[PDB]
Amino acid sequence: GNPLVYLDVDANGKPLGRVVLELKADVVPKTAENFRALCTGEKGFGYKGSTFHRVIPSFMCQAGDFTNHNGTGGKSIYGSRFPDENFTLKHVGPGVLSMANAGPNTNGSQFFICTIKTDWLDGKHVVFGHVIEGMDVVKKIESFGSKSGRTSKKIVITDCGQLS
Ligand SMILES: NCCOCCNC(=O)[C@@H]1CCNC(=O)/C=C/C(=O)N2CCC[C@H](C2)C(=O)N[C@@H](Cc2ccco2)C(=O)NCc2ccccc2CC(=O)N1
């Protein structure tokens, strides 16, 4: 019964394809529900039109700051921040979907998709899903990043929603 959601991504207006994500509501229901609702936009806000603002090759692709588009913003469906739900799931390799944060219990809407095993984040960021389809799209996104995280193209979530 875990939901499937999708992000359609383009770079400087050129479509990259669709990333499909399974959300592990069986393990982190509160975190999964937040992401699902931000994909559908059913609360009146969410990810559509927001960007991957920080992309670091051989690390991760970060997105979801739909208020400030720069890593300082975002908000969850519960409020501006909500706590770390649990650290049961681990950053085991590429395709892991995990919450960005600025310290303990600062989850909002920002998230990242790993391109390697980021196991030093275990117990520090809440893992809540993984890529079902479209790792090749993620690798395309990654190819527009840099060591600093600055991107070389504008990477936009042109559509998102829930598949099941
Ligand atoms: N650069 C070349 C060096 O390469 C080595 C690899 N670098 C690493 O491992 C680095 C090493 C240490 N730097 C950082 O923490 C970068 C901080 C950074 O950018 N700020 C600008 C934006 C506002 C501040 C500060 C912030 O903190 N905003 C949140 C996003 C967020 C806000 C509210 C909820 O969520 C964020 O962005 N958290 C960072 C993040 C996000 C996702 C996954 C992991 C991590 C840890 C990480 O990236 N750690």
Author numbering: 2 to 165
What does the publication say?
Cyclophilin D (CypD) is unique as a mitochondrial cyclophilin and a key regulator of the mitochondrial permeability transition pore (mPTP), a transient channel on the inner mitochondrial membrane that opens under oxidative stress or high mitochondrial matrix calcium levels. A key structural feature shared among all cyclophilin isoforms is a shallow and highly conserved PPIase active site. Adjacent to the active site is the S2 pocket, a distinct exo-site that forms part of a long substrate-binding groove for peptides. In particular, three gatekeeper residues (positions 123, 124, and 145 in CypD) and one far S2 pocket residue (position 118 in CypD) are highly diverse among cyclophilins.
Two library hits show modest inhibition of CypD prolyl-isomerase activity, JOMBt (half maximal inhibitory concentration (IC50CypD) = 17 μM) and JOBBt (IC50CypD = 45 μM). These results were verified by surface plasmon resonance, which yielded dissociation constants of: JOMBt KDCypD = 19 μM and JOBBt KDCypD = 45 μM. We used JOMBt as a scaffold to reveal structure–activity relationships and improve potency against CypD (A series). A26 engages CypD more extensively than JOMBt.
